[PDB]
Amino acid sequence: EFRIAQDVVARENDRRASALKEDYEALGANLARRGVDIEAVTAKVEKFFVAVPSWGVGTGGTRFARFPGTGEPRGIFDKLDDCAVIQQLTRATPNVSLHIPWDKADPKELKARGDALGLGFDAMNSNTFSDAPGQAHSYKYGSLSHTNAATRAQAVEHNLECIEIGKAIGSKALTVWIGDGSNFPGQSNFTRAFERYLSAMAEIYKGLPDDWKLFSEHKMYEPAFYSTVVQDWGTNYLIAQTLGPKAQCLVDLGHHAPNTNIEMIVARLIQFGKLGGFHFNDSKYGDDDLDAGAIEPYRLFLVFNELVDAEARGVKGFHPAHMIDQSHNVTDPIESLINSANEIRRAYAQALLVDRAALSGYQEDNDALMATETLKRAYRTDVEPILAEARRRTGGAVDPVATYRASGYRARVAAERPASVAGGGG
Amino acid sequence: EFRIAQDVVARENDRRASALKEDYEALGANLARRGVDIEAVTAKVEKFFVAVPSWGVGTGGTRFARFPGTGEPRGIFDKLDDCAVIQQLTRATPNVSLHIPWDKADPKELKARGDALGLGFDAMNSNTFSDAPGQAHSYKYGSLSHTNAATRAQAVEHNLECIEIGKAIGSKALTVWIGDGSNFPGQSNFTRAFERYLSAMAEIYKGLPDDWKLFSEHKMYEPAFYSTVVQDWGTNYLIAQTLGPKAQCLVDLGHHAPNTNIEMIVARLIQFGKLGGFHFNDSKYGDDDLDAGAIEPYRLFLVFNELVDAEARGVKGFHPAHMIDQSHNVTDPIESLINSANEIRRAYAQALLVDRAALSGYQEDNDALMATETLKRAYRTDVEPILAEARRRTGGAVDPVATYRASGYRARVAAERPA
Amino acid sequence: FRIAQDVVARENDRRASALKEDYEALGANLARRGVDIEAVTAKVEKFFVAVPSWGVGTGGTRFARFPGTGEPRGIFDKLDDCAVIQQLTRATPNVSLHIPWDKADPKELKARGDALGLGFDAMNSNTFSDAPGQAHSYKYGSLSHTNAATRAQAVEHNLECIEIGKAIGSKALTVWIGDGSNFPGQSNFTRAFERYLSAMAEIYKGLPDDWKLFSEHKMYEPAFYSTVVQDWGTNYLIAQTLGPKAQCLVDLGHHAPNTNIEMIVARLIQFGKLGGFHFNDSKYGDDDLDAGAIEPYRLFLVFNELVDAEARGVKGFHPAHMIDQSHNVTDPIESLINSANEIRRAYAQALLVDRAALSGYQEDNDALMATETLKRAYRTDVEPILAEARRRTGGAVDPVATYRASGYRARVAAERPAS
Amino acid sequence: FRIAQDVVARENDRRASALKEDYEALGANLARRGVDIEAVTAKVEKFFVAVPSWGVGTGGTRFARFPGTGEPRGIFDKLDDCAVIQQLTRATPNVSLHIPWDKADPKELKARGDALGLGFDAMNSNTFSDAPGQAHSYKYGSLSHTNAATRAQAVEHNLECIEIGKAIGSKALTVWIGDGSNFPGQSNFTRAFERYLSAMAEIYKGLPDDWKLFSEHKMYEPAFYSTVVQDWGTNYLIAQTLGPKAQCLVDLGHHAPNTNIEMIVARLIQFGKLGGFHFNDSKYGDDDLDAGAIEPYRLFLVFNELVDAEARGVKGFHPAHMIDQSHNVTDPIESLINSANEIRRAYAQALLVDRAALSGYQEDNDALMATETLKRAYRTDVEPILAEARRRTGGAVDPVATYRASGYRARVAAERPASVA
Numbered sequence A: 001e002f003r004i005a006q007d008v009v010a011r012e013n014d015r016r017a018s019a020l021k022e023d024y025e026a027l028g029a030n031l032a033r034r035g036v037d038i039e040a041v042t043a044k045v046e047k048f049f050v051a052v053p054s055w056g057v058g059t060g061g062t063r064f065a066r067f068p069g070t071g072e073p074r075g076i077f078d079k080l081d082d083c084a085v086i087q088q089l090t091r092a093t094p095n096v097s098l099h100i101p102w103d104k105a106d107p108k109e110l111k112a113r114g115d116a117l118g119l120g121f122d123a124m125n126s127n128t129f130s131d132a133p134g135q136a137h138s139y140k141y142g143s144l145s146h147t148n149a150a151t152r153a154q155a156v157e158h159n160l161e162c163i164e165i166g167k168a169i170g171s172k173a174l175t176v177w178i179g180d181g182s183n184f185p186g187q188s189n190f191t192r193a194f195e196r197y198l199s200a201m202a203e204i205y206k207g208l209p210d211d212w213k214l215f216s217e218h219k220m221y222e223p224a225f226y227s228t229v230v231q232d233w234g235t236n237y238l239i240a241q242t243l244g245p246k247a248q249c250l251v252d253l254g255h256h257a258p259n260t261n262i263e264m265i266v267a268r269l270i271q272f273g274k275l276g277g278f279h280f281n282d283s284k285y286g287d288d289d290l291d292a293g294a295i296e297p298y299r300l301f302l303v304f305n306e307l308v309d310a311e312a313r314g315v316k317g318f319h320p321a322h323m324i325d326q327s328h329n330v331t332d333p334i335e336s337l338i339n340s341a342n343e344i345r346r347a348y349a350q351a352l353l354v355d356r357a358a359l360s361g362y363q364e365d366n367d368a369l370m371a372t373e374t375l376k377r378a379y380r381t382d383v384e385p386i387l388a389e390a391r392r393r394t395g396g397a398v399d400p401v402a403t404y405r406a407s408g409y410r411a412r413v414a415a416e417r418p419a420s421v422a423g424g425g426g
Numbered sequence B: 001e002f003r004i005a006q007d008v009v010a011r012e013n014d015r016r017a018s019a020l021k022e023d024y025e026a027l028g029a030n031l032a033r034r035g036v037d038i039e040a041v042t043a044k045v046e047k048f049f050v051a052v053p054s055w056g057v058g059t060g061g062t063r064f065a066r067f068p069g070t071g072e073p074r075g076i077f078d079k080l081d082d083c084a085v086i087q088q089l090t091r092a093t094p095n096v097s098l099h100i101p102w103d104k105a106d107p108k109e110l111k112a113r114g115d116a117l118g119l120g121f122d123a124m125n126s127n128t129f130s131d132a133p134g135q136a137h138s139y140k141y142g143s144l145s146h147t148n149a150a151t152r153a154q155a156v157e158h159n160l161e162c163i164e165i166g167k168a169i170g171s172k173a174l175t176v177w178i179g180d181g182s183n184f185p186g187q188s189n190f191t192r193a194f195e196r197y198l199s200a201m202a203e204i205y206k207g208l209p210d211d212w213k214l215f216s217e218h219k220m221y222e223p224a225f226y227s228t229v230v231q232d233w234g235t236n237y238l239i240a241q242t243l244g245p246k247a248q249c250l251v252d253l254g255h256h257a258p259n260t261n262i263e264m265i266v267a268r269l270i271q272f273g274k275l276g277g278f279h280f281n282d283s284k285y286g287d288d289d290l291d292a293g294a295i296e297p298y299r300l301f302l303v304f305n306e307l308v309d310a311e312a313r314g315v316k317g318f319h320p321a322h323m324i325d326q327s328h329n330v331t332d333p334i335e336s337l338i339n340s341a342n343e344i345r346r347a348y349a350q351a352l353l354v355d356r357a358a359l360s361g362y363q364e365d366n367d368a369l370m371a372t373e374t375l376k377r378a379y380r381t382d383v384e385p386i387l388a389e390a391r392r393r394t395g396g397a398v399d400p401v402a403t404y405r406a407s408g409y410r411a412r413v414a415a416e417r418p419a
Numbered sequence C: 001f002r003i004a005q006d007v008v009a010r011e012n013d014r015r016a017s018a019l020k021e022d023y024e025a026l027g028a029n030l031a032r033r034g035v036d037i038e039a040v041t042a043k044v045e046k047f048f049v050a051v052p053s054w055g056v057g058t059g060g061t062r063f064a065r066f067p068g069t070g071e072p073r074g075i076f077d078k079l080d081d082c083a084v085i086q087q088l089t090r091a092t093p094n095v096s097l098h099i100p101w102d103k104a105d106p107k108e109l110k111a112r113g114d115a116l117g118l119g120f121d122a123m124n125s126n127t128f129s130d131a132p133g134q135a136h137s138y139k140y141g142s143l144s145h146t147n148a149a150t151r152a153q154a155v156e157h158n159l160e161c162i163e164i165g166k167a168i169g170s171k172a173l174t175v176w177i178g179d180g181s182n183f184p185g186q187s188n189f190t191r192a193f194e195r196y197l198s199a200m201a202e203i204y205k206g207l208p209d210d211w212k213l214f215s216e217h218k219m220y221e222p223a224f225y226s227t228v229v230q231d232w233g234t235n236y237l238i239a240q241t242l243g244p245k246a247q248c249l250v251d252l253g254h255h256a257p258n259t260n261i262e263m264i265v266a267r268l269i270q271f272g273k274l275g276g277f278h279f280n281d282s283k284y285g286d287d288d289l290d291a292g293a294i295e296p297y298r299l300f301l302v303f304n305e306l307v308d309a310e311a312r313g314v315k316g317f318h319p320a321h322m323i324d325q326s327h328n329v330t331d332p333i334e335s336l337i338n339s340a341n342e343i344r345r346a347y348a349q350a351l352l353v354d355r356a357a358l359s360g361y362q363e364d365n366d367a368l369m370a371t372e373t374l375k376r377a378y379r380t381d382v383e384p385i386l387a388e389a390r391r392r393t394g395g396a397v398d399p400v401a402t403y404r405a406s407g408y409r410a411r412v413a414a415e416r417p418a419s
Numbered sequence D: 001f002r003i004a005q006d007v008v009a010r011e012n013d014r015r016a017s018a019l020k021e022d023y024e025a026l027g028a029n030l031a032r033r034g035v036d037i038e039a040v041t042a043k044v045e046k047f048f049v050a051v052p053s054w055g056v057g058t059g060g061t062r063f064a065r066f067p068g069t070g071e072p073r074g075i076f077d078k079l080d081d082c083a084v085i086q087q088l089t090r091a092t093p094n095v096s097l098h099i100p101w102d103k104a105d106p107k108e109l110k111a112r113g114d115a116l117g118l119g120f121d122a123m124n125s126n127t128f129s130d131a132p133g134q135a136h137s138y139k140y141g142s143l144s145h146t147n148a149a150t151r152a153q154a155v156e157h158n159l160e161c162i163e164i165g166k167a168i169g170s171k172a173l174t175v176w177i178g179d180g181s182n183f184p185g186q187s188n189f190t191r192a193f194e195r196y197l198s199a200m201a202e203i204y205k206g207l208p209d210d211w212k213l214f215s216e217h218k219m220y221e222p223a224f225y226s227t228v229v230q231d232w233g234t235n236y237l238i239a240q241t242l243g244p245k246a247q248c249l250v251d252l253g254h255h256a257p258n259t260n261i262e263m264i265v266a267r268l269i270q271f272g273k274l275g276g277f278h279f280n281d282s283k284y285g286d287d288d289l290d291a292g293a294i295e296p297y298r299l300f301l302v303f304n305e306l307v308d309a310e311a312r313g314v315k316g317f318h319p320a321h322m323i324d325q326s327h328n329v330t331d332p333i334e335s336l337i338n339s340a341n342e343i344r345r346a347y348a349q350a351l352l353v354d355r356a357a358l359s360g361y362q363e364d365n366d367a368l369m370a371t372e373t374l375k376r377a378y379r380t381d382v383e384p385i386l387a388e389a390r391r392r393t394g395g396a397v398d399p400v401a402t403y404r405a406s407g408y409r410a411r412v413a414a415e416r417p418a419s420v421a
């Protein structure tokens, strides 16, 4: 099944083929003079994948308003159809991350559709930061760390159910992010709340298959505006170390305090074997959830520099579960995810260009200037040709968004899906 | 009419009257030893009012969820009834701030309900940061600064409508806060978007009554996550200055960058005559919209210190509009607004205690330690007795929240209103 | 006696009447709240915080240093000044030394301390600056420097600090270093940390059985891109890796903007790694300002966590309390006096918190009453308690005013030549 | 010449081949994009940024200063090192002086500058530190100090800076002061600012007809509670109040965390008060790190605003750019060289933006394509352009490599005595 007509992809690829060959060959020659085999780089890029969030193909909003576009997906099945477009064009997003109960449906169907669309399933995502219809206990004052035992049990039960759904569709991990925290000093006893969280998470841990992982995700604030139980990587580390070997930490780019050195957190988690994976996006003020690399592309590169450094050396078990976690409020969700997945592969490719041996030498000699310049020589390289050729060689589009717009896909689904209404948030 | 039974108020006041007399008399003796007449302070405190936001009367939420409590107001009229409780108990919130179209309803009836409940109306608040039913042009990419002329005109017209509603109920000001901005570099041309905004605001100013003020509110980010047209007080000053004498700047405490010295911004605006008013609330991370003084009470005091100093310096024509702008996500909105109004009067009261003569002396002599200690001697003073007595003498409750709960008001409206 | 006893007596008597009135008034108010003021005063008078030897001299920035008169010429003058702080506040019996700044014959330091009635807190090592005759520079790091010989030199320096501390009565070594990078790529984050861990393991081996090793994290400065011990997470990994004797020190001004510092304190306590505190205040970065001068509520909330620990019955909880400030525009002695006072102030207020009520409100998720329970304690002016604690222990009712009446500064100015 | 010509020629020839390949390849790619590489290079070789005389010496923090070898002592040694940066990058023909640090006979300063092929940019006054024999201390402020005699002393000092500047070819005075408070209540915000404005009015009166007075805002440090000239808002009030010759200086690292600095640049340009931009980079505060070493995209976004205005020559838009950094762990000359390079890099990339296309995507509210239009320019590796520009103007293809090959540092190390060694 091809969401995007093959004729359109071929047409748009041929229209740009000539320019691509010129740019690829020019870059190839430049890299050659730099002792780098462009083909080796392209080969790895072609194999780099990042999961797409099911809740990301729909238009997002803020607490102030939501301005939906046309052809908004009705549910998981429409979302999968849309995710298929992203994968077909970029070839960098073969897997989709589901969120329950948003995407709750017959596991068999989900699996059937994914298979037909050529999509797999990444980490499951539980939802105890909002109340569902007919829910017995409200999560207003928390969930896994709520002071009421019944509420915690209900939360634990929900997460276990997410694991059951995941096993039936091919998932191998559960990502746990909660809003648990407080808005006022004194409202929560920091320690007791955390103790309650660890005990509940230990219950969820018991329901994990032997080849499954449990990812806890920290966030400094929002929805909690005074304190958050899992507020930073420090608390996250304590959680993972306490729960067990299958418990690891997820680092979401926009979940840190202003000016935080995020790439260091990545290196620390790697050093202690607790880097479960990433949640890519970009930001300038808070948890903005913007398109990856749209605000600080260098920071994205620096994070990948830590990832590649580890990938280059003795790769223990190092297999971080990478996923995109963004909100598209003023763009066509599909186009944003396409360029975001592209930016991630861009950062990765540039990180692969780093002369590791030279960098090591400058680090040992404390030649700070040359060390940073060694990183910049890689970062400054325009690897777009590598990314475009990788897509072309794997059945993708040279220029994904251009092909997407040429296909008229959005107008198509807009004519098949019911209209949406603009609204608020809170 | 009284939303809260008068016998409950009297009862809960008598129950605490003895202790209050003890604390008030003790504080009185302490202030007298400091050369301060406690009566002069109480008199000023009972005259300090801050407007309550109609949109803060119902439970608030985030982009992740909203967890409504019981007895949620069904509309503006229920909201006015709840606002009447806040005023009755604290006596510090006689006026309500309306937001259109959220509170759109027959102005004539709003006025009638207000008068009956003993409530007045503060500044009107326009809303072009969200789309309304049947709206011709979406504000997705902006409003007053939108690239499309027809959209900007529609936004201007909406603001003029807000003025018409306000004139009918006795409002004398229009506050304009928009989300206009960009989420990506390059999406907007900073200068052209600002030029469009200035031109639209000029049209609104043209339609502003000569007995009204026009307040522009700056905000660093949210809903825009890369750039915001009216992002800080600098741009806000340029706006007010450009528009005219009737245009001023509104300062919302949670709308500034991390570590910003907000009290300095307040002083700067006062010095150049553009401090239109305040939107009180507290915060720790961003525009958290938490109960005022719940996070950084000293900062709140420092802001009031600049307000009181303005009077001491002889600044004239200075009558800032005071308004609360908060979101109550995990508490009873009424109780939060009650304690927030209380906290604001608390900071004001402490600012009144500052020995201006001593402070001035320490500032001229560059005695930093004693200057800061002079501020602390005021801030460290527990003025709760003054706050409680002010309420008691004006028909309010010694302990507002305690009386509120003792009245069972929440359960009452929970029964009258759906779930 | 650094300050004449007749001066202390005279100033105490001059303020005795007002102290009596305020204390008794507060005593009655607390009694009505079910609190025994005598019990609070008894604990307050036993709360001690170490004074930094390096804080008695005027501090500066990279732009300039503006010394005052009578700057101490060395460690002995510094101890003399520290004795003034202790005599007047009775809250700072111990001094924290820094090597090599305070290097001197251990026997003489001990003798001077005993003579002045002062003890010694944790020793502090210095590998963030180069001393004369140093075989290796710390320009690119110390304990984590790529060069093995440089790390060895840093280790030996720390071992020397322990030897000095053992001779004077110290029972801990605090390690803060500037190690980090100013450019991406300059350092391999993991290898630099591994080098640090190896060096610290060596230092740990030289620890007596009753000693502790405190590592102090800092987000930035002097390193402006990355810092090896950048936050509490890395700090926890250090203490856990080193062993039972290794704990973490939390310096209030060393965290990222908006960080919830009190939570960090609670987390470290829960896992038994809260070695101690470095008290100070700040608004922008590691400003090192007088404790409580900027965010007094935050200071109170940190103490609320320390007191709750005691309430929860945490076993063997004896954090080391120390002031770590820089006094750039005030008399260092006066700032340390009022800073020690602010710390006792926040501690006293934390003791006033009705834990029983708080426990109930936290259980029932009554956020508003829970926060109001904390506020009822924080808003209480405990100055009378602090003042009476000093009176009873031979200190001054108003420390700074007594200091000024003594003419001490002028005295030492005439005795000490400016360099 | 500070650096031997044969060394420059040798290191250029060594890299000439690869440069031709890369330059011709980029010229071809740009041609396909409808851009003439030559037009970009012609402008790049004419883009200059002043080097701070105080930037060639090793910087330090309040904890320590770790000097390298051959540290320049005094303005003459400093000019000698600044000449190296200019000869190799050809992007820093002018030096910014600081008084009293660089105090010396004007005639001699002018002579040494002409001899080295260096001019002089804005003068920089210093009332944030006390000089020996000073009548009044600046401990509690300078231009806004409560003591009248102290303000008068600060004003006279600034006037003296103007006199020195007039004698050496300078056409502006930059005023950055530490004035502020470390404690609430210590200063009366309004009165302090009034005193400042009054003192600046006096300095303004001493300005020649063709001179400019630049005020520089800073959120904090050395003042840790409040700063008189804390941000661009206050800065704008200053410039607007003083007159046509007064403008604002924007120092990248002087803003609150997460501030949108490029917007501040746009606002000032719109109102004709952008006097100049002080380049450096940062991650935490006023770190004063090498430009573009931390956030190169932000630097590009700032230049996007500059180029936009430079193309439409806005009224009052003639910014005086300068590098204002502190080099604590690198060879200062090498950092200034690579920082000047980064500045021209961001300038070159901003010059590549398809303004027509961008304006089109902005009007249609196509946020994705608008941001991608900026990225297409930013992702372009313009090093071949910067290198050819240097090669054509007498500089080095690879500045730092040529500097190291010359052995300059070892040379001045042998000529200048270190404190110990």
Ligand SMILES: O=C[C@H](O)[C@H](O)[C@H](O)[C@H](O)CO
Pocket: A055, A125, A177, A217, A219, A252, A279, A287, A325
């Ligand atoms: O802020 C929320 C985190 O990003 C979580 O990963 C969350 O579940 C996700 O964003 C979906 O809302």
Ligand SMILES: O=C[C@H](O)[C@H](O)[C@H](O)[C@H](O)CO
Pocket: B055, B125, B177, B217, B219, B252, B279, B287, B325
């Ligand atoms: O963030 C928005 C500002 O606080 C405005 O005053 C706004 O109108 C108010 O918050 C209502 O949502």
Ligand SMILES: O=C[C@H](O)[C@H](O)[C@H](O)[C@H](O)CO
Pocket: C054, C124, C176, C216, C218, C251, C278, C286, C324
């Ligand atoms: O910032 C440095 C830390 O506070 C250290 O404790 C340091 O040793 C202290 O400031 C004295 O320099």
Ligand SMILES: O=C[C@H](O)[C@H](O)[C@H](O)[C@H](O)CO
Pocket: D124, D176, D216, D218, D251, D278, D286, D324, D325
């Ligand atoms: O921080 C100070 C500013 O950068 C000034 O421009 C200053 O004159 C220079 O950087 C050094 O004093």
Ligand SMILES: [Zn+2]
Pocket: A177, A217, A252, A279, A325
């Ligand atoms: Zn996430």
Ligand SMILES: [Zn+2]
Pocket: A252, A254, A255, A287, A289, A325
């Ligand atoms: Zn998030």
Ligand SMILES: [Zn+2]
Pocket: B177, B217, B252, B279, B325
């Ligand atoms: Zn507001």
Ligand SMILES: [Zn+2]
Pocket: B219, B252, B254, B255, B287, B289
């Ligand atoms: Zn707001």
Ligand SMILES: [Zn+2]
Pocket: C176, C216, C251, C278, C324
């Ligand atoms: Zn410290």
Ligand SMILES: [Zn+2]
Pocket: C218, C251, C253, C254, C286, C288
């Ligand atoms: Zn510090």
Ligand SMILES: [Zn+2]
Pocket: D176, D216, D251, D278, D324
């Ligand atoms: Zn500067």
Ligand SMILES: [Zn+2]
Pocket: D251, D253, D254, D286, D288, D324
């Ligand atoms: Zn600076």
